[PDB]
Amino acid sequence: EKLGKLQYSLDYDFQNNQLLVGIIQAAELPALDMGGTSDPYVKVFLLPDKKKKFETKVHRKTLNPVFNEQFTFKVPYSELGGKTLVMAVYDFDRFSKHDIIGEFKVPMNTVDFGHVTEEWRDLQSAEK
Ligand SMILES: [Ca+2]
Ligand SMILES: [Ca+2]
Ligand SMILES: [Ca+2]
Structure with missing residues (x-):
């Protein structure tokens, strides 16, 4: 099974003290419907609390979507380090x-927050 990936671009602005989560695009996702398609949309949140649980616009009938949606969480830096960033790309069944x-999950203590961390990270198979 070709499980696919999500590219992101994540920064922290220290003048306002907010987290920034730039959800760009996903590539090569499985079809979970009876016509070889998916309706993908990303659920984007923080562990362990789940303060501002976000949902992208649904890009119906494609295995390679482009979201381009920056999700902003207004949280201080001493509280951000312990918190772990989650993105879960979901099929919309209506x-x-x-x-x-x-x-996949990404700890803020592993992210060096000089400028922007921009990278492709792979989506692992969830049974939810
Ligand atoms: Ca489905
Ligand atoms: Ca569906
Ligand atoms: Ca279903």
């Missing part, structure tokens, strides 16, 4: 329980 594509 009526039934929404079938997960996959997910």
Whole structure:
């Protein structure tokens, strides 16, 4: 199974003291519907609390979508280090329980916050 990835561009602005989470694009995702398609959308939040749980616009009928949506969490830097950033790209099924594509987590203590960390990180298979 070709499980795919999500590219992000994540920064912290120290004049306002806020987190910044630039969700760019996903590539090569599995089809979870009876026509070889997916309806992808990213659920974007922070551990362990879940302060501002976000949802991107749904890009219906594609396995390679482009979101371009920066999600801002207004949190101080001493509280940010312990918190771990989650992105879970989901298939929208309109009526039934929404079938997960996959997910990964990124600790803020591993991110060096000089400018912007911009990288492709891979989506691992979730059973949710
Ligand atoms: Ca589905
Ligand atoms: Ca669907
Ligand atoms: Ca379903």
